[PDB]
Amino acid sequence: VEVLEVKITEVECFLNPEMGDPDENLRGFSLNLSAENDFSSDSPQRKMLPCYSTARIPLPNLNEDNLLMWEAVTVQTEVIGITSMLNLHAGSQKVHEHGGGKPIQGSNFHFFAVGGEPLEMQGVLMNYRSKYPDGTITPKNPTAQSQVMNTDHKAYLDKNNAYPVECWVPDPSRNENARYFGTFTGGENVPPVLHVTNTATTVLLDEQGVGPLCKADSLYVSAADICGLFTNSSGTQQWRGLARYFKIRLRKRSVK
Amino acid sequence: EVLEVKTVDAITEVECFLNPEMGDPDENLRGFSLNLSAENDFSSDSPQRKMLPCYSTARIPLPNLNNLLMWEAVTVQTEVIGITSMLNLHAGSQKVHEHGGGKPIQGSNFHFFAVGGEPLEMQGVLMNYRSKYPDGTITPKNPTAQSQVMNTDHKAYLDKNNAYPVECWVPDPSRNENARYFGTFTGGENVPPVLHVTNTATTVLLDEQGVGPLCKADSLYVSAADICGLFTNSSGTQQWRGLARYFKIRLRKRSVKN
Amino acid sequence: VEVLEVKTVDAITEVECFLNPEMGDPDENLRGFSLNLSAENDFSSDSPQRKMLPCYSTARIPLPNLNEDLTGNLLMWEAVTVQTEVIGITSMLNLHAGSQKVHEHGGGKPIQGSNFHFFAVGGEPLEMQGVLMNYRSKYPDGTITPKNPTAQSQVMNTDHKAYLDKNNAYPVECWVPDPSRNENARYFGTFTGGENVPPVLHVTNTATTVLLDEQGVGPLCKADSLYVSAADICGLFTNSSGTQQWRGLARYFKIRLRKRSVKN
Amino acid sequence: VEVLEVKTGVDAITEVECFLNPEMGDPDENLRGFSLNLSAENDFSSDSPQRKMLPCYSTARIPLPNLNLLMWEAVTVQTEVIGITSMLNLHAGSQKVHEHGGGKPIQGSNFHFFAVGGEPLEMQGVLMNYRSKYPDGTITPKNPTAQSQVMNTDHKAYLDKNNAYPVECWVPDPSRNENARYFGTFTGGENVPPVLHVTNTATTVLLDEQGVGPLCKADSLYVSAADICGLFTNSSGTQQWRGLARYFKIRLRKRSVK
Amino acid sequence: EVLEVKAITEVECFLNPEMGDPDENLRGFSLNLSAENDFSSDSPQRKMLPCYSTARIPLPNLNEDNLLMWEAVTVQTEVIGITSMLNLHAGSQKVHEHGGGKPIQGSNFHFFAVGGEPLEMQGVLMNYRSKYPDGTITPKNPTAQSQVMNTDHKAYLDKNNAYPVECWVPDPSRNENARYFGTFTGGENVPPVLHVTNTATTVLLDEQGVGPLCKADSLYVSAADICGLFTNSSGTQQWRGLARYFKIRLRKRSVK
Ligand SMILES: [Cl-]
Ligand SMILES: [Cl-]
Ligand SMILES: [Cl-]
Ligand SMILES: [Cl-]
Ligand SMILES: [Cl-]
């Protein structure tokens, strides 16, 4: 529909990570990782699989102000609790005899989105013959083509802690009413590098000065913040994730 | 000679996904190469077709037109699709140690794209001129020792998909007057892959004088190579892994003298 | 606080400060180091020694009172810019004392591994949010750590809010600056984790950070005080034996301030 | 050398292009672009490297159209390393990374350097070891002392012969080269990954603060390069330097001088 | 008071490194590093300690007859001989059987300054109980506090080859009349990364448009360029240093 003239409120929210949480005391961690399954019998357990975080954020009803819609203009966001990884005394395997614990390191994924509706996602699989567990939503009727680009695998990030990170990326051919940003760093011993500052703002307005338009007086925040692998004294490995903070500035926009 | 920009229906967007062409050794390993061999003498180097990753290319047809009118490519949005699929450490990859997770994809990688008004122009360079390339590949014809450095005979068009091996060919900086190309190669056993996705990033394709690629025959050419690293199997065999690349291109009608 | 016009002089002032690090100080001779790090404590049995936990540094700098009376425009000090650097980085080029040989007949092992470089400047104490690796850790007397933690303290638990109101008491491993508050401060930090991460530290008297927000307003010093805060964990020192210690260094601050008018 | 006005109108601009080959040592007719195997652990008192083990600076004089006063002025250069994807061949020659693995990538110490000047590059000599005995066909610092291992102002030369000046003996001289522009990056290490970019969208302006470029004496332009990509590890454990060609495209204009 | 800009001279100098020079032949190298000395008994040899380089450059007298001083406006600088490190055939331990020699690598420090008086140093020590050798100038009467900040340790860089790099840094609380720039990179395996170009200039003017002012007609250059460690065949290690070029553009400035 036709976007018209601008006619200014802040929302803030703290999205928890969904790393698998194998029992209550391991909130923020996945189950121990399995290794060396044949592509032809790869059946990962639910609690081993990090999933995308999402929340529907209700916004003030605009009935007392064609229509009006909230417009997202800017967001400030950071990963919460980065210094917790300076605890090298709890749970982690010694680097060597008499040494402290092994830092969280290895492959990591840091990702956020702000939109006027659920994030649109595309499925890609490492191994199309993976049997995903109950409580996950993964590409339906995958083929070999699902290990590169198969355009049947389209979804909405419409449920929290359901869509595994290894199965889904944001869809660049859609997401007209959202902005998203992500960096993947892969490797056995990659160091995590995380920055905090209250002086960083991201602008959400497009080439024509229009931010995401909030449908049904709601916005969707999305995140995945896999910080790396935690190595237990036994040699077992677990994903560790951290919460993400969002502060979103919005203004009223007339539409038709 | 390039004249005036034109100004209803003087703008068009086209979008597509290019699939990677890494070798596809069997019906279930689409997006991977055959296991890499090692330590072949220069005198007896005969790589199998399915071990060799190839440049991806496609020709996108644009609406016909008629001091000629041509479509001009102004901006591109591109990312690699499926970067999170590397967070599956449970399938096929060798354990990092006893009781450990699978080894992540890592090692030598190459990220490349191009947008042109005609096929990408390539220069051939070889690690080993005596390498014997298999049927189904197109490689520098009749190379010499000189072909291991610069040999100006090795000129080709990226004019066929899944045929031009990445290890044999580079974009030619002495040509490609009607195209824009971007590439980064990172070599090493342990190189971490580092990949960014956002729908807010745009490359401008216009040159110093405000002209983008002009599409001959109302056709646009997209080119890619996205080798993400090596997958290490439980046995210790390694394979290339690749991913698809998204393109969105904004074009505009431009007038040209005959 | 409704903000009005910048005054112009006798309108401008500069304060400077050297903040020492609080790495734990295990004995009289090892100022700037932690106790030997322990390893492999079960989450159900994790009681770290006071001297093993580096803490945030903080200092309160007194400023000149500006108001003849408070009876309906106040003057306040506004922080505009800061120069800051880590003091003594070249001390890590001592490879002859205490550090394990890299191999037979080799130099000592450089300081390396996980590090955290953090600073802030505010018109009030830094506001902090608690997050724990392990909510079952038993923290020692003389530290201030998240009260009544649950499993949610391993992710985000909005109950863990604190003021950095005391030097050498808030452990770096329990607390981050709170991006949901600190309306009247500016903070900057980088965490780099890994067993063999190289330290990369720059010194120059030519670098300035601007503390003004989008509206051109800097931190406003309530009660004629400026709060500086730092954490500079440089990495891990590996002794002959194989035991490791955090090493930390002091941070310089030079802050320029101007007189700003406010309503009330 | 008094500089006056930039000349104007038709035929006031020219454009030269050059593919400069690397000079890595070429130990036999088939190993064009490599060095001889690296020796190791020679005492400083008895260090006598074989010529084919020593990479040298590349250079060429490019002759320009005769003008006579007018001189050609170099204003821009586009430059690129050629064949960077050739390092994705891990099947030929190189030591396997482990049992059943691919070949070991080229990695380690690397040097990427180019220059554009209106006369030969001016160079300063600096030795790791002043007692090194250099072989026939190489040009190295004369009568070096222990001071040659730091700064000896005696060691001035012109880059006036291709494949003669060893890269280990010479650096561009920042106290001279008023009539040239040089750019280099040294990365040292046993395992450093090579990182190389290609794009036809990057230009270096060669104009100084006053807006003056290299003025081309005796209607000559001097290009210079060193592109040591890293070390190739043969399956026996021997190592060789691997070099690549460098492309130049230089835009020039006529400048008035008295 | 700093008055008006009155014309122009250029000074140049190549400042040698001071790495320890253990014998006549090993100019530009330290003595083999010792390891594992107790804090309570750490007595390093003179020839093992790299020191700061400095030189006072004499300028033309201005006020033979508002007074005039020389103002330093720009500097071009680079490290000289970076390519010498491509000699892997001399002295260095092989990387493996039949392999080339081990490149120089590990901890490095690259620093320069330009002032109109001597560089002002602050003392900080790894180990305050270190006993420093004759021929060096180090913090007087140090305490534990000398391992962090101890304001007693102030000194002018007044003597070439005397102030050990490991004991001193530029003082950011002082040096109103100099500009300094330095990077430390620590670690066993750190690669040296060095750039050369005759097209890079550092501007030395401050916020108010004023460069360093040469107090009594002299300009002071300071440097330390520790490139990393050379590993001999035996396994022993020595610092390697390189000279630094400076070209400094100066202009006449009126003062009170
Ligand atoms: Cl699906
Ligand atoms: Cl050909
Ligand atoms: Cl609390
Ligand atoms: Cl000479
Ligand atoms: Cl002192």
Numbering used by the authors:
A (entry chain BBB): 32 to 38, 44 to 101, 106 to 296
B (entry chain AAA): 33 to 39, 41 to 99, 106 to 297
C (entry chain CCC): 32 to 39, 41 to 103, 105 to 297
D (entry chain EEE): 32 to 99, 107 to 296
E (entry chain DDD): 33 to 38, 43 to 101, 106 to 296
What does the paper behind this entry write?
BK polyomavirus (BKPyV) is a small, non-enveloped, double-stranded DNA virus with an icosahedral capsid formed by 72 capsomers, where a capsomer is an association of a pentamer of the VP1 protein linked internally to a single copy of either the VP2 or the VP3 proteins. BK polyomavirus (BKPyV) is an opportunistic pathogen that uses the b-series gangliosides GD1b and GT1b as entry receptors. Viruses sampled sequentially from these patients accumulated multiple mutations in the BC loop region of the VP1 protein, which is involved in the direct interaction of the virus with sialic acids. All variant VP1 pentamer structures were globally similar to the WT VP1 pentamer with a doughnut-shaped ring composed of a central pore surrounded by five VP1 monomers in 5-fold symmetry.
The structure of the N-Q variant VP1 pentamer was also solved at 2.01 Å. Although no major change was observed in the backbone orientation of the BC loop that carried the K69N and E82Q mutations, the mutation from lysine to asparagine at position 69 modified the sialic acid binding pocket of the VP1 pentamer. Lysine 69 is involved directly with the double sialic acid part of the b-series gangliosides by making van der Waals, salt bridge, and hydrogen bond interactions through its side chain, and its replacement by asparagine leads to loss of those interactions. On the other hand, the K69N mutation in the K69N-E82Q variant leads to a steric clash that precludes sialic acid binding. Here also with the double mutant VP1, N-Q, in sharp contrast to the other four VP1 proteins, binding was not detected to any sialylated or non-sialylated glycans included in the screening arrays. Also consistent with the glycan array results, N-Q VLPs did not bind any of the tested gangliosides. However, the N-Q variant maintained its ability to infect 293TT cells after sialic acid removal, indicating that its infection occurs in a sialic acid-independent manner. Thus, another receptor must be involved to support N-Q variant infection in 293TT cells. Finally, as predicted, no infection was seen in any supplementation condition for the N-Q variant, confirming that gangliosides are not used by this variant for infectious entry. The N-Q variant lost binding to sialylated glycans, but it retained some infectivity, suggesting that in certain conditions, BKPyV may interact directly with the unknown receptor for entry.
